[PDB]
Design a binder for these strands. Structure first.
Ligand SMILES: [Mn+2]
Ligand SMILES: [Mn+2]
Ligand SMILES: [Mn+2]
Ligand code: NA
Length: 326
DNA sequence: CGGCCTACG
DNA sequence: CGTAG
DNA sequence: GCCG
């Protein structure tokens, strides 16, 4: 009754197994810090299954037959049901390795591989990094300078103000171009780490060269604290009562022919899209990315005019963005 | 056992 | 290497 | 870590 792929089931933003899913996601995150993408995926998938259930898991028997629940994930749930805590999870939580890798990878410009190298060098704190700026890229310097603001959640009220300033710049750069909110806010989140926008133009080809023109205009308005094509990963100045704060903003351009694929990809969730691409390739023999959907036997691309088209071409029931919170 | 999403900057 | 969902 |  529970399909194996996250793109085969609705997953709402809020659900009935929050504590259980959180614990499994700690173990997933820890596996990622150790470079075990397979273990990360299984724990992420198990967590996602619980988010899709219609009511709370109260007894171990309710895990029977659920996909991605084997001995390990089942034992985590068992311990949480019986004692309210899982010793493995708590050991990860308090571990110096987990805490430091989490802190370092949160920095814009720092990935698992950099964080791990710094950890092995003995570094543990942000001030450790600041007192050695020669070891840092300009991207990492920006991420470290702005880390405090970037650690503060973006609110949906922030988002609407940002969208209007992006629209004004986009309108000067190319009249008729449009701006669509994507990412977690499109899935209904009330908060986020960043804001994602997708830009296109109704006349195919008119979007060529657009993003540099948009960025130059935002920079001239004094709004860009950091940036640097079709993707721009920025830090923006956002107004605040009597001051401002730094906010991560991603700007993406797509031709209108590819817009449904780009919208689908950039709306996420991350696990939803990995699962959708995995389903496409393994179950349907089609190759999906944010530009299109390729049939490698006919050597043809599927034209899509909507996200609904894409779900139909993959043989999946349509899920609105609010149900893609895998 | 092999596989685990698939891009761009 | 970083970034994205 | 789990599916197939
Ligand atoms: Mn986002
Ligand atoms: Mn983003
Ligand atoms: Mn993301
Ligand atoms: Na990072």
């Amino acid at each position: 009754w529970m399909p194996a792929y996250a793109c085969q089931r609705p997953t709402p933003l809020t659900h009935h197994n929050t504590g259980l899913s959180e614990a499994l996601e700690i173990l997933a995150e820890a596996a990622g810090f150790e470079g075990s993408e397979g273990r990360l995926l299984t724990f992420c998938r198990a967590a996602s299954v619980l988010k899709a259930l219609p009511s709370p898991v109260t007894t171990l028997s309710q895990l029977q037959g659920l996909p991605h629940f084997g001995e390990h994930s089942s034992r985590v749930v068992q311990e949480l049901l019986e004692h309210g805590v899982c010793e493995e999870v708590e050991r990860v939580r308090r571990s110096e390795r987990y805490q430091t890798m989490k802190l370092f990878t949160q920095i814009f410009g720092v990935g698992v591989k950099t964080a791990d190298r710094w950890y092995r060098e003995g570094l543990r704190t942000l001030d450790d990094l600041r007192e050695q700026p020669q070891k840092l890229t300009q991207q990492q310097k920006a991420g470290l300078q702005h880390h405090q603001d970037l650690s503060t959640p973006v609110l949906r009220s922030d988002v609407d103000a940002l969208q209007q300033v992006v629209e004004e710049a986009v309108g000067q750069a190319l009249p008729g171009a449009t701006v669509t909110l994507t990412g977690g806010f499109r899935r209904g989140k009330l908060q986020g780490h960043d804001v994602d926008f997708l830009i296109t133009h109704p006349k195919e080809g008119q979007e060529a060269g657009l993003l540099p023109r948009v960025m130059c205009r935002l920079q001239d308005q004094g709004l860009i604290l950091y940036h640097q094509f079709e993707r721009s990963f920025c830090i923006f100045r956002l107004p605040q009562p009597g001051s401002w704060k730094a906010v991560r903003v991603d700007l993406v351009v797509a031709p209108v022919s590819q817009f449904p694929f780009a919208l689908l990809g950039w709306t996420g969730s991350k696990l939803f899209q990995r699962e959708l691409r995995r389903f496409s390739r393994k179950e349907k023999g089609l190759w999906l990315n944010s530009h299109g959907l390729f049939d490698p036997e006919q050597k043809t691309f599927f034209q899509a005019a909507s996200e609904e088209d894409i779900f139909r071409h993959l043989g999946l029931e349509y899920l609105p963005p609010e149900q893609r919170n895998a």
